[PDB]
Design a protein around this motif. Structure first.
Motif, PDB file in Angstrom:
ATOM      1  N   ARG A 157       0.816  -1.109  -0.011  1.00  0.00           N
ATOM      2  CA  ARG A 157       0.072  -0.118   0.109  1.00  0.00           C
ATOM      3  C   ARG A 157       0.869   1.392  -0.072  1.00  0.00           C
ATOM      4  NH1 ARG A 157      -4.257   1.029   4.936  1.00  0.00           N
ATOM      5  NH2 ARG A 157      -4.902   3.250   4.361  1.00  0.00           N
ATOM      6  N   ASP A 161       1.310   4.343  -2.784  1.00  0.00           N
ATOM      7  CA  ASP A 161       1.218   5.811  -2.690  1.00  0.00           C
ATOM      8  C   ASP A 161       2.242   6.519  -2.994  1.00  0.00           C
ATOM      9  OD1 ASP A 161      -1.384   4.945  -1.915  1.00  0.00           O
ATOM     10  OD2 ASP A 161      -0.885   5.205   0.280  1.00  0.00           O
ATOM     11  N   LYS A 164       1.959   6.851  -6.668  1.00  0.00           N
ATOM     12  CA  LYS A 164       1.133   7.694  -6.853  1.00  0.00           C
ATOM     13  C   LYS A 164       1.787   9.408  -6.766  1.00  0.00           C
ATOM     14  CE  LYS A 164      -2.795   7.498  -4.859  1.00  0.00           C
ATOM     15  NZ  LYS A 164      -3.941   7.039  -3.916  1.00  0.00           N
ATOM     16  N   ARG A 165       2.509   9.590  -5.666  1.00  0.00           N
ATOM     17  CA  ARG A 165       2.792  11.012  -5.625  1.00  0.00           C
ATOM     18  C   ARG A 165       3.855  11.360  -6.554  1.00  0.00           C
ATOM     19  NH1 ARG A 165       5.951  14.151  -2.295  1.00  0.00           N
ATOM     20  NH2 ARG A 165       4.866  15.932  -1.038  1.00  0.00           N
ATOM     21  N   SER A 192      -2.230  -0.937  -6.979  1.00  0.00           N
ATOM     22  CA  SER A 192      -1.790   0.016  -8.274  1.00  0.00           C
ATOM     23  C   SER A 192      -2.747   0.003  -9.350  1.00  0.00           C
ATOM     24  CB  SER A 192      -0.263  -0.472  -8.509  1.00  0.00           C
ATOM     25  OG  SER A 192      -0.281  -1.715  -9.013  1.00  0.00           O
ATOM     26  N   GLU A 195      -5.327   2.127  -8.493  1.00  0.00           N
ATOM     27  CA  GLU A 195      -5.131   3.410  -8.497  1.00  0.00           C
ATOM     28  C   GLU A 195      -4.619   4.160 -10.011  1.00  0.00           C
ATOM     29  OE1 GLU A 195      -5.730   5.227  -6.342  1.00  0.00           O
ATOM     30  OE2 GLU A 195      -5.792   4.161  -4.513  1.00  0.00           O
ATOM     31  N   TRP A 444       5.088   7.440   6.211  1.00  0.00           N
ATOM     32  CA  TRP A 444       3.826   6.686   5.764  1.00  0.00           C
ATOM     33  C   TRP A 444       3.108   6.199   7.011  1.00  0.00           C
ATOM     34  CZ3 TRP A 444       0.868   2.264   5.601  1.00  0.00           C
ATOM     35  CH2 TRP A 444      -0.208   2.393   4.651  1.00  0.00           C
ATOM     36  N   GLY A 447      -1.775   5.183   5.684  1.00  0.00           N
ATOM     37  CA  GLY A 447      -2.241   5.718   4.588  1.00  0.00           C
ATOM     38  C   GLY A 447      -1.937   7.129   4.258  1.00  0.00           C
ATOM     39  N   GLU A 448      -1.592   8.040   5.548  1.00  0.00           N
ATOM     40  CA  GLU A 448      -1.292   9.287   5.264  1.00  0.00           C
ATOM     41  C   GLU A 448       0.308   9.465   4.914  1.00  0.00           C
ATOM     42  OE1 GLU A 448       0.199  11.598   8.270  1.00  0.00           O
ATOM     43  OE2 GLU A 448       0.475  13.193   6.563  1.00  0.00           O
ATOM     44  N   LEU A 449       0.503   9.774   3.695  1.00  0.00           N
ATOM     45  CA  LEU A 449       2.041   9.863   3.005  1.00  0.00           C
ATOM     46  C   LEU A 449       2.351  11.626   3.128  1.00  0.00           C
ATOM     47  CD1 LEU A 449       4.359   8.878   1.701  1.00  0.00           C
ATOM     48  CD2 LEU A 449       3.153   9.225  -0.519  1.00  0.00           C
TER      49      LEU A 449
END
Ligand SMILES: *[C@@H]1O[C@H](CO[C@@H]2O[C@@H](C)[C@@H](O)[C@@H](O)[C@@H]2O)[C@@H](O[C@@H]2O[C@H](CO)[C@@H](O)[C@H](O)[C@H]2NC(C)=O)[C@H](O)[C@H]1NC(C)=O
Ligand SMILES: *[C@@H]1O[C@H](CO)[C@@H](O)[C@H](O)[C@H]1NC(C)=O
Lengths: 507, 123
Positions: A157, A161, A164-165, A192, A195, A444, A447-449
């Protein structure tokens, strides 16, 4: 065969398995004769068990007027030995001193499964500190299993992320053959794909495969090179090291960016010798800061005064390769005697997973505390409701359990007995001239990156369109920009009225 | 719990030899260091000899060095005290003790005691 135990008396007795010795060699695996003593995975975790129980007993807020004891046995990081010692745990339960209420550990996920298949039968809750297999989340197969570590799914996970970022919508994937690699890579694929991230191609390999095999793997990775430069590697350290050695052998150092799992977090045994190949890599490291009071306790320990750790004397004499003159477990074959000047402070390295051991112990404690308060409300101690302790009810209370951890983290279990994940994102930067070291770049937290940015690399399959996207038999991220008619408007990215004409935006 | 049972004592004419045996119960024997003791009537208990858990590390009191030898058979869970050149001032009840932790001998933390066997040295 012929094993000692580390015990501590109390009203409630909590069992624990630690690999105080290395696992047997292939010859002595049937005799189950284990190897040498282990400091970080063994002795230190044993002493932490003991001293953390001391602290909880001395805590008036947590279990007042209830003493916690323990029975600590040696798992040897081996399933046969572990099952042996767990049978010794339920020995007393079979015939019907002070039966085991719960068990801490063990370390390996496979060994933890083997121990769990036995502990579930007698309804003994189990809390683990380093077994991260996704298999252990199935509570129809592992009903009395809980861990204070995030599973490998959380690593997948966090990598999704990270991808993604940085708009890395087209990446290659390598994972190590086995439970870790394949479970984590499947989780990465699923997360992935959901997303909108595509895999050029997925690969798999063992760490022990030849230079032949990693050269083939690196050439196949080069096959995608113009478009897919980021290689998500759900890999144990030696696979990453083999890729780096292949990058050395082929001279392809620095044409890829490797996104490593916790199997290569800041492990120097992976990048040492091939730093120049690995520079630029981004890894995930399980955040576990050191516990200060454990060092305070542990470093003061002398063999003359440790009267509760049975392995502490062979540990002491193996640590400083000396002979404890006149001691009960004096070992010969050492060519020098132990000085009174020897101290554990010399080249001390705390166990990496110490905080998790301590948090598992606190989890057991707070579960017992909440059960006591729900069954013995007006009491301060064990009433007849908890005589004996119902493992069903202890599990029920542990699934509800929730504290503030040893480092400030709030520890909590989901509907699967899984703990949320806080990793720190490392970068293997070049620190000046001929110095390479891991650098904390981000965090991380479940979930909060958050990433301390500006520390780019482009891995995309196709560039955006101007005024529609159309795909061949290939993947969703590889498209062609086909224009529309003069009377047609852009309905959405992929698909293209009378009296009206398409607007100046072609909306 | 471990049980320690002594045997081999009795009446012995001075200058003779006598071999005391200490049999233990339980499979933890190889993890305990062992020590012999003696209590004579009207006298305080003293340490005689000791051997480490592995064997191969023996310690003797000054009053019996050169006369007694302590040994252990781990395959039989037994400790042995061979007593030679027995003097009348050796007459006492000899005890067998198991200890796991402790500092340099005789400063050991003995966890288990035996019932004892009488050794009577006639002149
Ligand atoms: C998580 O738990 C807290 C309280 O649990 C405490 O955690 C430690 C920090 C320590 O203080 C222990 O004694 C406890 O185990 C919950 O906070 C409570 O919230 C209610 C309101 O819903 C409030 O009335 C209580 O006073 C709070 N408890 C304390 C000790 O202040 C919190 O709600 C829990 N969160 C979840 C998601 O379960
Ligand atoms: C335990 O109970 C006694 C009364 O029996 C009380 O005096 C004592 O303070 C209690 N201890 C704690 C830690 O609550």
């Amino acid at each position: 065969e012929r094993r000692v135990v580390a015990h501590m008396p109390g009203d409630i007795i909590i069992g624990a398995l630690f690999s105080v010795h290395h696992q047997p060699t292939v010859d002595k695996v049937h005799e189950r004769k284990c190897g040498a003593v282990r400091e970080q995975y063994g002795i230190q975790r044993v002493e932490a068990m003991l001293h953390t129980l001391e602290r909880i007993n001395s805590d008036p807020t947590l279990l007042p007027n209830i003493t916690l004891g323990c029975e600590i046995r040696d798992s040897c990081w081996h399933s046969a030995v572990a099952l042996e010692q767990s049978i010794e745990f339920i020995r007393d339960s079979l015939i019907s001193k002070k039966p085991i209420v719960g068990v801490i550990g063990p370390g390996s996920s496979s060994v933890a499964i083997q121990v769990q298949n036995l502990l579930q039968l007698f309804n003994i809750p189990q809390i683990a500190y380093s077994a991260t297999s996704m298999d252990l989340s199935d509570k129809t197969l592992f009903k009395y299993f809980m861990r204070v570590v995030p599973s490998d799914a959380q690593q997948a996970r966090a990598m999704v992320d990270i991808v993604k970022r940085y708009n890395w919508t087209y990446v290659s994937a390598v994972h190590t053959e086995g439970n870790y690699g394949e479970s984590g890579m499947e989780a990465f694929k699923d997360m992935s794909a959901k997303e909108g991230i595509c895999i050029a191609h997925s690969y798999k390999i063992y760490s022990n495969a030849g230079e032949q095999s990693f050269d083939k793997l690196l050439k196949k990775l080069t096959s995608h090179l113009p478009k897919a430069r980021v290689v998500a590697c759900f890999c144990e350290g030696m696979t990453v090291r083999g890729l780096l050695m292949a990058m050395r052998r082929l001279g392809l150092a620095g044409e890829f960016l490797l996104l490593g799992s916790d199997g290569w977090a800041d492990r120097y045994d992976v990048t040492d010798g091939y730093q120049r190949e690995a520079v630029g890599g981004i890894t995930i490291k399980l955040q576990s800061p050191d516990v200060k009071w454990f060092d305070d306790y542990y470093l003061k320990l002398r063999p003359e005064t440790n009267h509760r750790n049975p392995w502490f004397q062979e540990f002491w004499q193996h640590r400083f390769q000396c002979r404890l003159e006149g001691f009960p477990q004096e070992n010969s074959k050492y060519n020098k005697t132990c000085n009174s000047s020897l101290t554990l402070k010399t080249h001390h390295v705390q166990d990496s997973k110490m905080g998790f051991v301590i948090n598992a112990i606190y989890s057991m404690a707070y579960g017992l505390h909440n059960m006591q308060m729900s069954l013995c409300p007006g009491y301060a101690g064990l009433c007849d409701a908890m005589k004996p302790i119902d493992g069903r009810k202890l599990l029920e209370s542990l699934m509800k359990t929730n504290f503030t951890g040893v480092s400030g983290d709030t520890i909590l279990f989901d509907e699967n007995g899984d703990s949320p994940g806080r990793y720190e994102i490392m970068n293997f930067k070049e620190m000046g001239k001929d110095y390479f070291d891991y650098i904390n770049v981000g965090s991380w937290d479940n979930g909060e990156l958050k990433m301390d940015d500006d520390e780019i690399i482009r891995s995309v399959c196709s560039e955006p369109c101007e005024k529609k996207v159309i795909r061949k038999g290939e993947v969703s991220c590889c498209w062609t920009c086909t224009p529309c008619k003069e009377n047609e408007y852009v309905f959405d990215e992929y698909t293209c009225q009378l009296g009206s004409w398409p607007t100046d935006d072609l909306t | 719990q471990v049980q320690l049972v002594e045997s081999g004592g009795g009446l012995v004419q001075a200058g003779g030899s006598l071999r005391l045996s200490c049999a233990a119960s339980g499979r933890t024997f190889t993890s305990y260091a062992m020590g012999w003791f003696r209590q004579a009537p009207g006298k305080e208990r003293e340490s005689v000899a000791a051997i480490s858990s592995s064997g191969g590390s023996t310690h003797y009191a000054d009053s019996v060095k050169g006369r007694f030898t302590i040994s252990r058979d781990n395959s039989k869970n037994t400790v042995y005290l061979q007593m030679n050149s027995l003097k009348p001032e050796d007459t006492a009840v000899y005890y067998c003790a198991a200890a796991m932790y402790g500092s340099r001998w005789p400063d050991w933390e003995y966890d288990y005691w035996g019932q004892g066997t009488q050794v009577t040295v006639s002149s």
